[PDB]
């Protein structure tokens, strides 16, 4: 039926039907030719991955199949991988090769992953922290992951202080010190609504104390560097 429909249609329509059927690599190529963005295909791939994460056996086998229609770069002997993990790697590879604006692709993947919730893996987390930590924080608040948000904030503070700055893309002659204050504000507001969990209050207090310490040290370093330049 979609065959007849393609018979008399246009590019956007083709892309739509291909994504629905599951032929993703072809959709990718078509998007590139007409300069259409790759968002659709990345989102479709993310959907399949979420489906497999929590899905039945038949879905898993069909998944293996459509992977052969696409192109898996290498063969890995891991028994634990199964079809689902193979589809994950395919998506990852397609992303690396056909990449454009970073914000767009990562965004759409993360959004689709949080269709019904998912614990992101550590490699992805680290890559994102090294590129766009602010966007990483915003998606947390979108689905109310306050504790993870606080952990990220603490790690970013540590990176700005020189401890593992490489993992956050912080270059540091002090110059760069961009701190996302608005996000911290929103986090505090979310924490101070229900005000029921004692543990939450405790973690908030700890974070605040640590931040205050950070700021005093920042002020000392400030005075020092100002004196130096002068």
């Amino acid at each position: 039926s979609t065959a007849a429909i393609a018979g008399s249609s246009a590019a956007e329509e083709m892309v739509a039907l291909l994504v629905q059927a599951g032929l993703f690599d072809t959709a990718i190529s078509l998007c590139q030719t007409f300069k259409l963005a790759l968002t659709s295909v990345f989102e479709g791939l993310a959907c399949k991955c979420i489906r497999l994460q929590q899905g039945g056996e038949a879905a898993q086998a069909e998944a293996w199949e459509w992977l052969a229609a696409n192109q898996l770069a290498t063969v890995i002997t891991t028994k634990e991988s199964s079809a689902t993990d193979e589809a994950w790697r395919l998506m990852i590879s397609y992303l690396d090769k056909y990449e454009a604006k970073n914000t767009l692709y990562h965004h759409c993947i993360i959004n689709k992953l949080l269709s019904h919730g998912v614990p992101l893996p550590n490699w992805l987390i680290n890559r994102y922290k090294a590129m766009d930590a602010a966007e990483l924080l915003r998606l947390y608040l979108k689905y109310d992951l306050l504790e993870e948000a606080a952990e990220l904030v603490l790690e970013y503070v540590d990176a700005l202080l020189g401890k593992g700055h490489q993992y956050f893309g912080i270059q540091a002659t002090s110059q760069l010190v961009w701190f996302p204050y608005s996000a911290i504000d929103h986090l505090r507001q979310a924490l101070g609504e229900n005000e029921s969990n004692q543990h939450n209050q405790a973690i908030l207090s700890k974070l605040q104390r640590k931040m205050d310490e950070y700021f005093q040290k920042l002020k000392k370093a400030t005075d020092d560097y100002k004196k130096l330049v002068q």
Binding site: Q53, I76, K79, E80, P119, P121, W123
Partner: protein, 312 residues
Amino acid sequence: MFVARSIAADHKDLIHDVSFDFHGRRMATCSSDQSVKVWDKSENVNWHCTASWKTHSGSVWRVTWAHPEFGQVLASCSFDRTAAVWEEIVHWVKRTTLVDSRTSVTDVKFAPKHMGLMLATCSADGVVRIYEAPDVMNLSQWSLQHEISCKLSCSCISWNPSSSRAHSPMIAVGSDDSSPNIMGKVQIYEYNENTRKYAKAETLMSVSDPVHDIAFAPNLGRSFHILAVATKDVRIFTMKPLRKSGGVTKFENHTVAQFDNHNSQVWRVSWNITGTVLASSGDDGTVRLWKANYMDNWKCIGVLKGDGNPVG
């Protein structure tokens, strides 16, 4: 017939840890002079040194041989937050230097072969990092996949040797922190496939004393598992999984043996190939072997003197 062999070590400095290979013919001896020597066994029992090289400035703790199916792969953790992977070329050659850890990597353990080549490193910060090599031909590429926070200073790690598909991968993590009040220093982490991440399953609150070494016993086609914990006293536990999902299957723990016969701190615990005889070390300088009889009663079967002679 217990024999005594005196092989001149040819080591300029104190030897720390030795480890046999899978088939029992190749062994690596790391020493305090920052050198790792590989001794191989000929047709005659005589051992011969084949390769000697310097590895790390930091104090090398453990050396782990991988399954021969993947090749002659070694691993060495050190004080300087590094975990190097070694491979011969036909001389041992460093392929990677895992340095994601911010604190001294204390223990390194290779994953059972059925999962793949997944080196695991625990560090003093309290984070267990499980890396993974995608292709065995290229050993320079290692991608971190799972980081497990334990909230306590890790001292030792041990995988579950079980290859049963029903038993999801499990890793045990100890805590050497001399906490005055905090108990539960042995934590078991299970892999939930649905969340594709490691989650805590059971915490052995009974162990309230610093844990020096943990070791799983081969399952041998049994419903329950056995974990040996080396603290101030040797303790053997039995974790029977409960009935049956969306989450970790809770466990039921029973302490079946507790031996304080060492009268000192138990530092090391290791099982034999079939998990019947457990050995233990101590400050007394003796290695006591423990074996269970037909009535499941563990008893000491051998003690050793410092000069090398056996205790009669």
